[PDB]
Amino acid sequence: RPKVRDREGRINYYWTLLEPGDTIIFEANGNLIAPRYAFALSRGFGSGIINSNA
Amino acid sequence: GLFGAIAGFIEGGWTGMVDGWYGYHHQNEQGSGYAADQKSTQNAINGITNKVNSVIEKMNTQFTAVGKEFNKLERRMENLNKKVDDGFIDIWTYNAELLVLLENERTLDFHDSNVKNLYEKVKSQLKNNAKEIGNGCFEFYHKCNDECMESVKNGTYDYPKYSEESKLNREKI
């Protein structure tokens, strides 16, 4: 790939939500960027993001 | 109110008059009684009727399923739907309530109108043949039996027929 931050290679980033009781399973023979820390959160609802210098 | 007849110089209403919204009370020897002026009352019923039937009958509503169900990676869509529903509800609530307020005021003012205009209708027939006693009431100088009263009610009154007697009774007053 064209040099971005001087790097011809890439990492595609992926995420998902794991509800209680359910189990997530990773398997790999290579190219994995494993998780180290995850985020146990409760939801909240109906907000947005602000982009300003105030 | 806005014209000073209802709650204005006419302090209150006539619980005994069931013939309609607007009417008369006479006091000729033959006796008293209440009547209604069906012309103005009927025009008011037609107008108000048309108003209400205009706030109701104007609501076209297509067949619509308001509900939409989304999964856990469609929160943007779910909040968009929520945004549509909530927007319309805000609009209709605000506009509906202010509409009811404003048009209630307008209706009361319309009744006040009809009564004042009716008072003036009677006044313009009795210029010097009567005086303005109290409120919503005229006292005659010539005695006016039922026939004459029922004449004031249907518009025809015949003034010069009673002008002389009046000219007499008025001088000493």
PDB file of C-alpha atoms in Angstrom:
ATOM      1  CA  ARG A   1       0.000   0.000   0.000  1.00  0.00           C
ATOM      2  CA  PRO A   2       1.087   3.637  -0.389  1.00  0.00           C
ATOM      3  CA  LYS A   3       3.148   4.830   2.551  1.00  0.00           C
ATOM      4  CA  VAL A   4       0.886   6.179   5.300  1.00  0.00           C
ATOM      5  CA  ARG A   5       2.912   7.150   8.356  1.00  0.00           C
ATOM      6  CA  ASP A   6       5.699   5.457   6.370  1.00  0.00           C
ATOM      7  CA  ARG A   7       4.061   2.011   6.334  1.00  0.00           C
ATOM      8  CA  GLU A   8       3.174  -0.022   3.239  1.00  0.00           C
ATOM      9  CA  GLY A   9       1.161  -2.473   5.373  1.00  0.00           C
ATOM     10  CA  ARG A  10      -2.067  -2.060   7.312  1.00  0.00           C
ATOM     11  CA  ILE A  11      -4.134  -3.277  10.257  1.00  0.00           C
ATOM     12  CA  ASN A  12      -7.893  -3.552   9.823  1.00  0.00           C
ATOM     13  CA  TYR A  13      -9.647  -2.800  13.112  1.00  0.00           C
ATOM     14  CA  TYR A  14     -12.726  -4.693  14.274  1.00  0.00           C
ATOM     15  CA  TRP A  15     -14.987  -4.671  17.317  1.00  0.00           C
ATOM     16  CA  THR A  16     -18.125  -6.219  18.744  1.00  0.00           C
ATOM     17  CA  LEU A  17     -20.354  -6.258  21.814  1.00  0.00           C
ATOM     18  CA  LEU A  18     -20.472  -9.363  24.016  1.00  0.00           C
ATOM     19  CA  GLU A  19     -23.656  -9.547  26.067  1.00  0.00           C
ATOM     20  CA  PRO A  20     -23.593 -11.230  29.494  1.00  0.00           C
ATOM     21  CA  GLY A  21     -23.484 -15.011  29.566  1.00  0.00           C
ATOM     22  CA  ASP A  22     -22.156 -15.199  26.019  1.00  0.00           C
ATOM     23  CA  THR A  23     -18.594 -16.263  25.202  1.00  0.00           C
ATOM     24  CA  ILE A  24     -16.236 -14.859  22.557  1.00  0.00           C
ATOM     25  CA  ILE A  25     -13.689 -17.154  20.900  1.00  0.00           C
ATOM     26  CA  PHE A  26     -10.573 -16.193  18.932  1.00  0.00           C
ATOM     27  CA  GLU A  27      -8.627 -18.679  16.818  1.00  0.00           C
ATOM     28  CA  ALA A  28      -5.640 -17.954  14.627  1.00  0.00           C
ATOM     29  CA  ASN A  29      -2.439 -19.186  13.023  1.00  0.00           C
ATOM     30  CA  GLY A  30      -1.163 -15.659  12.371  1.00  0.00           C
ATOM     31  CA  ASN A  31      -1.910 -12.035  11.555  1.00  0.00           C
ATOM     32  CA  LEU A  32      -3.940 -11.545  14.756  1.00  0.00           C
ATOM     33  CA  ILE A  33      -3.700  -8.382  16.842  1.00  0.00           C
ATOM     34  CA  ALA A  34      -5.203  -9.838  19.990  1.00  0.00           C
ATOM     35  CA  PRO A  35      -7.211  -7.824  22.516  1.00  0.00           C
ATOM     36  CA  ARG A  36      -5.483  -6.967  25.776  1.00  0.00           C
ATOM     37  CA  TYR A  37      -8.046  -4.724  27.493  1.00  0.00           C
ATOM     38  CA  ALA A  38     -11.800  -4.756  26.904  1.00  0.00           C
ATOM     39  CA  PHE A  39     -14.509  -2.420  28.182  1.00  0.00           C
ATOM     40  CA  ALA A  40     -17.307  -3.673  30.442  1.00  0.00           C
ATOM     41  CA  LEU A  41     -20.003  -1.020  30.021  1.00  0.00           C
ATOM     42  CA  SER A  42     -23.682  -0.385  30.534  1.00  0.00           C
ATOM     43  CA  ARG A  43     -25.400   1.303  27.660  1.00  0.00           C
ATOM     44  CA  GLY A  44     -26.928   4.742  27.888  1.00  0.00           C
ATOM     45  CA  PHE A  45     -28.993   6.080  25.031  1.00  0.00           C
ATOM     46  CA  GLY A  46     -29.532   8.805  22.464  1.00  0.00           C
ATOM     47  CA  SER A  47     -26.546  11.157  22.341  1.00  0.00           C
ATOM     48  CA  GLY A  48     -23.989  12.383  19.820  1.00  0.00           C
ATOM     49  CA  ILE A  49     -20.456  13.679  19.341  1.00  0.00           C
ATOM     50  CA  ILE A  50     -19.309  17.304  19.165  1.00  0.00           C
ATOM     51  CA  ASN A  51     -16.432  18.554  16.991  1.00  0.00           C
ATOM     52  CA  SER A  52     -15.405  22.039  18.111  1.00  0.00           C
ATOM     53  CA  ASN A  53     -12.480  23.917  19.641  1.00  0.00           C
ATOM     54  CA  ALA A  54     -14.568  25.582  22.344  1.00  0.00           C
TER      55      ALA A  54
ATOM     56  CA  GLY B   1     -65.039  40.801  26.758  1.00  0.00           C
ATOM     57  CA  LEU B   2     -63.342  41.937  23.560  1.00  0.00           C
ATOM     58  CA  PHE B   3     -66.503  43.867  22.587  1.00  0.00           C
ATOM     59  CA  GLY B   4     -67.825  44.616  26.073  1.00  0.00           C
ATOM     60  CA  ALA B   5     -71.224  42.911  25.783  1.00  0.00           C
ATOM     61  CA  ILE B   6     -70.744  39.440  27.290  1.00  0.00           C
ATOM     62  CA  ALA B   7     -69.169  39.984  30.714  1.00  0.00           C
ATOM     63  CA  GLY B   8     -69.287  43.668  29.725  1.00  0.00           C
ATOM     64  CA  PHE B   9     -72.395  45.802  30.111  1.00  0.00           C
ATOM     65  CA  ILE B  10     -74.530  42.618  29.992  1.00  0.00           C
ATOM     66  CA  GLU B  11     -73.458  41.180  33.339  1.00  0.00           C
ATOM     67  CA  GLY B  12     -74.753  37.643  32.885  1.00  0.00           C
ATOM     68  CA  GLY B  13     -76.868  35.086  31.092  1.00  0.00           C
ATOM     69  CA  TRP B  14     -80.480  33.927  31.047  1.00  0.00           C
ATOM     70  CA  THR B  15     -80.745  30.379  32.383  1.00  0.00           C
ATOM     71  CA  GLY B  16     -84.446  30.377  31.448  1.00  0.00           C
ATOM     72  CA  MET B  17     -83.903  30.854  27.701  1.00  0.00           C
ATOM     73  CA  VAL B  18     -83.627  27.405  26.095  1.00  0.00           C
ATOM     74  CA  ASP B  19     -84.760  28.309  22.561  1.00  0.00           C
ATOM     75  CA  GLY B  20     -81.181  29.147  21.578  1.00  0.00           C
ATOM     76  CA  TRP B  21     -78.014  31.130  22.210  1.00  0.00           C
ATOM     77  CA  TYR B  22     -79.387  34.636  21.575  1.00  0.00           C
ATOM     78  CA  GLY B  23     -82.778  36.025  22.445  1.00  0.00           C
ATOM     79  CA  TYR B  24     -85.142  38.475  24.062  1.00  0.00           C
ATOM     80  CA  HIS B  25     -87.012  39.176  27.291  1.00  0.00           C
ATOM     81  CA  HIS B  26     -90.075  41.424  27.054  1.00  0.00           C
ATOM     82  CA  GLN B  27     -92.271  43.051  29.702  1.00  0.00           C
ATOM     83  CA  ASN B  28     -95.572  44.137  28.173  1.00  0.00           C
ATOM     84  CA  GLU B  29     -98.619  44.107  30.474  1.00  0.00           C
ATOM     85  CA  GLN B  30     -99.887  40.916  28.813  1.00  0.00           C
ATOM     86  CA  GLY B  31     -96.903  39.276  30.488  1.00  0.00           C
ATOM     87  CA  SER B  32     -93.224  38.406  30.331  1.00  0.00           C
ATOM     88  CA  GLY B  33     -91.377  35.500  28.706  1.00  0.00           C
ATOM     89  CA  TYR B  34     -88.124  34.519  27.023  1.00  0.00           C
ATOM     90  CA  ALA B  35     -87.585  33.975  23.306  1.00  0.00           C
ATOM     91  CA  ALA B  36     -84.651  33.282  20.996  1.00  0.00           C
ATOM     92  CA  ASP B  37     -83.599  35.037  17.794  1.00  0.00           C
ATOM     93  CA  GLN B  38     -83.230  32.017  15.520  1.00  0.00           C
ATOM     94  CA  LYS B  39     -81.542  33.978  12.715  1.00  0.00           C
ATOM     95  CA  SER B  40     -78.410  34.970  14.645  1.00  0.00           C
ATOM     96  CA  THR B  41     -78.398  31.792  16.747  1.00  0.00           C
ATOM     97  CA  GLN B  42     -78.659  29.657  13.602  1.00  0.00           C
ATOM     98  CA  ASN B  43     -75.907  31.577  11.804  1.00  0.00           C
ATOM     99  CA  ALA B  44     -73.693  31.094  14.867  1.00  0.00           C
ATOM    100  CA  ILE B  45     -74.446  27.362  14.985  1.00  0.00           C
ATOM    101  CA  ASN B  46     -73.578  27.088  11.290  1.00  0.00           C
ATOM    102  CA  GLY B  47     -70.342  29.029  11.754  1.00  0.00           C
ATOM    103  CA  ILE B  48     -69.115  27.194  14.852  1.00  0.00           C
ATOM    104  CA  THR B  49     -70.217  23.852  13.400  1.00  0.00           C
ATOM    105  CA  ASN B  50     -68.184  24.632  10.288  1.00  0.00           C
ATOM    106  CA  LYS B  51     -65.185  25.555  12.450  1.00  0.00           C
ATOM    107  CA  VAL B  52     -65.124  22.318  14.454  1.00  0.00           C
ATOM    108  CA  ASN B  53     -65.846  20.211  11.374  1.00  0.00           C
ATOM    109  CA  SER B  54     -62.940  22.133   9.816  1.00  0.00           C
ATOM    110  CA  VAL B  55     -60.474  21.257  12.588  1.00  0.00           C
ATOM    111  CA  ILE B  56     -61.565  17.596  12.469  1.00  0.00           C
ATOM    112  CA  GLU B  57     -62.431  16.777   8.855  1.00  0.00           C
ATOM    113  CA  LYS B  58     -59.128  18.311   7.673  1.00  0.00           C
ATOM    114  CA  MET B  59     -57.020  15.499   9.185  1.00  0.00           C
ATOM    115  CA  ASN B  60     -56.012  13.204   6.369  1.00  0.00           C
ATOM    116  CA  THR B  61     -54.034  10.230   7.686  1.00  0.00           C
ATOM    117  CA  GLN B  62     -52.664   7.536   5.396  1.00  0.00           C
ATOM    118  CA  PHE B  63     -52.310   3.948   6.541  1.00  0.00           C
ATOM    119  CA  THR B  64     -49.075   3.981   8.534  1.00  0.00           C
ATOM    120  CA  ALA B  65     -47.086   1.644  10.777  1.00  0.00           C
ATOM    121  CA  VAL B  66     -45.163   3.960  13.096  1.00  0.00           C
ATOM    122  CA  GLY B  67     -43.052   1.182  14.598  1.00  0.00           C
ATOM    123  CA  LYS B  68     -39.618   0.191  13.334  1.00  0.00           C
ATOM    124  CA  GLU B  69     -37.430  -2.430  14.993  1.00  0.00           C
ATOM    125  CA  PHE B  70     -33.642  -2.409  14.688  1.00  0.00           C
ATOM    126  CA  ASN B  71     -30.747  -4.554  15.880  1.00  0.00           C
ATOM    127  CA  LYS B  72     -27.623  -3.549  17.846  1.00  0.00           C
ATOM    128  CA  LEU B  73     -25.506  -2.276  14.918  1.00  0.00           C
ATOM    129  CA  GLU B  74     -28.325  -0.013  13.673  1.00  0.00           C
ATOM    130  CA  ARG B  75     -28.324   2.504  16.530  1.00  0.00           C
ATOM    131  CA  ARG B  76     -27.860   5.341  14.041  1.00  0.00           C
ATOM    132  CA  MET B  77     -30.994   4.182  12.213  1.00  0.00           C
ATOM    133  CA  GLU B  78     -32.886   3.604  15.466  1.00  0.00           C
ATOM    134  CA  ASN B  79     -32.061   7.120  16.682  1.00  0.00           C
ATOM    135  CA  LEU B  80     -33.050   8.485  13.264  1.00  0.00           C
ATOM    136  CA  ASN B  81     -36.478   6.828  13.475  1.00  0.00           C
ATOM    137  CA  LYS B  82     -36.768   8.038  17.073  1.00  0.00           C
ATOM    138  CA  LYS B  83     -35.857  11.499  15.764  1.00  0.00           C
ATOM    139  CA  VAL B  84     -38.618  11.448  13.131  1.00  0.00           C
ATOM    140  CA  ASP B  85     -41.323  10.239  15.527  1.00  0.00           C
ATOM    141  CA  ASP B  86     -40.281  12.665  18.260  1.00  0.00           C
ATOM    142  CA  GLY B  87     -40.130  15.561  15.809  1.00  0.00           C
ATOM    143  CA  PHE B  88     -43.648  15.008  14.511  1.00  0.00           C
ATOM    144  CA  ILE B  89     -45.010  14.551  18.039  1.00  0.00           C
ATOM    145  CA  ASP B  90     -43.441  17.845  19.124  1.00  0.00           C
ATOM    146  CA  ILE B  91     -44.918  19.652  16.108  1.00  0.00           C
ATOM    147  CA  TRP B  92     -48.446  18.293  16.473  1.00  0.00           C
ATOM    148  CA  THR B  93     -48.552  18.818  20.241  1.00  0.00           C
ATOM    149  CA  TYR B  94     -47.446  22.455  20.054  1.00  0.00           C
ATOM    150  CA  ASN B  95     -49.555  23.443  17.037  1.00  0.00           C
ATOM    151  CA  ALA B  96     -52.596  21.544  18.320  1.00  0.00           C
ATOM    152  CA  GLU B  97     -52.599  23.157  21.756  1.00  0.00           C
ATOM    153  CA  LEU B  98     -52.008  26.703  20.499  1.00  0.00           C
ATOM    154  CA  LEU B  99     -54.699  26.129  17.864  1.00  0.00           C
ATOM    155  CA  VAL B 100     -57.210  25.157  20.567  1.00  0.00           C
ATOM    156  CA  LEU B 101     -56.270  28.189  22.677  1.00  0.00           C
ATOM    157  CA  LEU B 102     -56.383  30.786  19.899  1.00  0.00           C
ATOM    158  CA  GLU B 103     -59.608  29.435  18.408  1.00  0.00           C
ATOM    159  CA  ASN B 104     -61.320  29.279  21.801  1.00  0.00           C
ATOM    160  CA  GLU B 105     -60.539  32.977  22.241  1.00  0.00           C
ATOM    161  CA  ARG B 106     -61.826  33.586  18.708  1.00  0.00           C
ATOM    162  CA  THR B 107     -65.078  31.729  19.416  1.00  0.00           C
ATOM    163  CA  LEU B 108     -65.844  33.622  22.625  1.00  0.00           C
ATOM    164  CA  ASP B 109     -65.118  36.883  20.802  1.00  0.00           C
ATOM    165  CA  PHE B 110     -67.486  35.723  18.042  1.00  0.00           C
ATOM    166  CA  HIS B 111     -70.360  35.234  20.490  1.00  0.00           C
ATOM    167  CA  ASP B 112     -69.625  38.614  22.093  1.00  0.00           C
ATOM    168  CA  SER B 113     -69.821  39.975  18.540  1.00  0.00           C
ATOM    169  CA  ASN B 114     -73.197  38.442  17.774  1.00  0.00           C
ATOM    170  CA  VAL B 115     -74.752  39.753  20.991  1.00  0.00           C
ATOM    171  CA  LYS B 116     -73.406  43.297  20.609  1.00  0.00           C
ATOM    172  CA  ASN B 117     -74.504  43.420  16.967  1.00  0.00           C
ATOM    173  CA  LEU B 118     -77.966  42.233  18.024  1.00  0.00           C
ATOM    174  CA  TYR B 119     -78.219  44.927  20.706  1.00  0.00           C
ATOM    175  CA  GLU B 120     -77.292  47.499  18.066  1.00  0.00           C
ATOM    176  CA  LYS B 121     -79.873  46.051  15.659  1.00  0.00           C
ATOM    177  CA  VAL B 122     -82.579  46.740  18.233  1.00  0.00           C
ATOM    178  CA  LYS B 123     -81.149  50.163  19.117  1.00  0.00           C
ATOM    179  CA  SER B 124     -81.171  51.366  15.492  1.00  0.00           C
ATOM    180  CA  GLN B 125     -84.942  50.687  15.377  1.00  0.00           C
ATOM    181  CA  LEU B 126     -85.949  52.604  18.510  1.00  0.00           C
ATOM    182  CA  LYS B 127     -83.782  55.748  18.339  1.00  0.00           C
ATOM    183  CA  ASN B 128     -86.070  58.205  20.169  1.00  0.00           C
ATOM    184  CA  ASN B 129     -88.994  55.861  20.953  1.00  0.00           C
ATOM    185  CA  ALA B 130     -87.017  54.371  23.861  1.00  0.00           C
ATOM    186  CA  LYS B 131     -84.163  54.968  26.292  1.00  0.00           C
ATOM    187  CA  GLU B 132     -81.248  52.725  27.270  1.00  0.00           C
ATOM    188  CA  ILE B 133     -82.186  51.490  30.742  1.00  0.00           C
ATOM    189  CA  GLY B 134     -79.745  49.328  32.662  1.00  0.00           C
ATOM    190  CA  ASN B 135     -78.000  46.854  30.385  1.00  0.00           C
ATOM    191  CA  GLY B 136     -79.256  44.850  27.432  1.00  0.00           C
ATOM    192  CA  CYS B 137     -82.651  46.449  28.036  1.00  0.00           C
ATOM    193  CA  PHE B 138     -84.743  49.249  26.542  1.00  0.00           C
ATOM    194  CA  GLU B 139     -87.711  51.013  28.138  1.00  0.00           C
ATOM    195  CA  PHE B 140     -90.419  52.204  25.769  1.00  0.00           C
ATOM    196  CA  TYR B 141     -92.221  55.524  25.858  1.00  0.00           C
ATOM    197  CA  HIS B 142     -95.237  53.969  24.112  1.00  0.00           C
ATOM    198  CA  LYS B 143     -96.757  50.721  25.357  1.00  0.00           C
ATOM    199  CA  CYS B 144     -95.795  47.784  23.106  1.00  0.00           C
ATOM    200  CA  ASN B 145     -98.114  44.757  23.249  1.00  0.00           C
ATOM    201  CA  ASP B 146     -96.959  41.288  22.159  1.00  0.00           C
ATOM    202  CA  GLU B 147     -97.571  42.089  18.483  1.00  0.00           C
ATOM    203  CA  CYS B 148     -95.178  45.061  18.623  1.00  0.00           C
ATOM    204  CA  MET B 149     -92.500  43.076  20.490  1.00  0.00           C
ATOM    205  CA  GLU B 150     -92.713  40.229  17.972  1.00  0.00           C
ATOM    206  CA  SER B 151     -92.302  43.041  15.440  1.00  0.00           C
ATOM    207  CA  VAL B 152     -88.971  44.142  16.926  1.00  0.00           C
ATOM    208  CA  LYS B 153     -87.923  40.484  16.891  1.00  0.00           C
ATOM    209  CA  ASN B 154     -88.507  39.901  13.153  1.00  0.00           C
ATOM    210  CA  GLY B 155     -86.907  43.230  12.175  1.00  0.00           C
ATOM    211  CA  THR B 156     -90.099  45.028  11.155  1.00  0.00           C
ATOM    212  CA  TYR B 157     -90.974  47.552  13.862  1.00  0.00           C
ATOM    213  CA  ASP B 158     -92.820  50.488  12.258  1.00  0.00           C
ATOM    214  CA  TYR B 159     -91.430  53.604  13.961  1.00  0.00           C
ATOM    215  CA  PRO B 160     -93.621  56.507  12.751  1.00  0.00           C
ATOM    216  CA  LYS B 161     -96.704  54.559  13.858  1.00  0.00           C
ATOM    217  CA  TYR B 162     -95.514  55.058  17.456  1.00  0.00           C
ATOM    218  CA  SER B 163     -93.502  58.279  17.067  1.00  0.00           C
ATOM    219  CA  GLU B 164     -96.163  60.676  18.393  1.00  0.00           C
ATOM    220  CA  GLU B 165     -96.978  58.954  21.704  1.00  0.00           C
ATOM    221  CA  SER B 166     -93.223  58.726  22.252  1.00  0.00           C
ATOM    222  CA  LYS B 167     -92.741  62.420  21.495  1.00  0.00           C
ATOM    223  CA  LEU B 168     -95.270  63.121  24.250  1.00  0.00           C
ATOM    224  CA  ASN B 169     -93.995  60.746  26.932  1.00  0.00           C
ATOM    225  CA  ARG B 170     -90.367  61.845  26.423  1.00  0.00           C
ATOM    226  CA  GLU B 171     -90.624  65.615  26.972  1.00  0.00           C
ATOM    227  CA  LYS B 172     -91.107  65.692  30.750  1.00  0.00           C
ATOM    228  CA  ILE B 173     -88.494  62.977  31.393  1.00  0.00           C
TER     229      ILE B 173
END
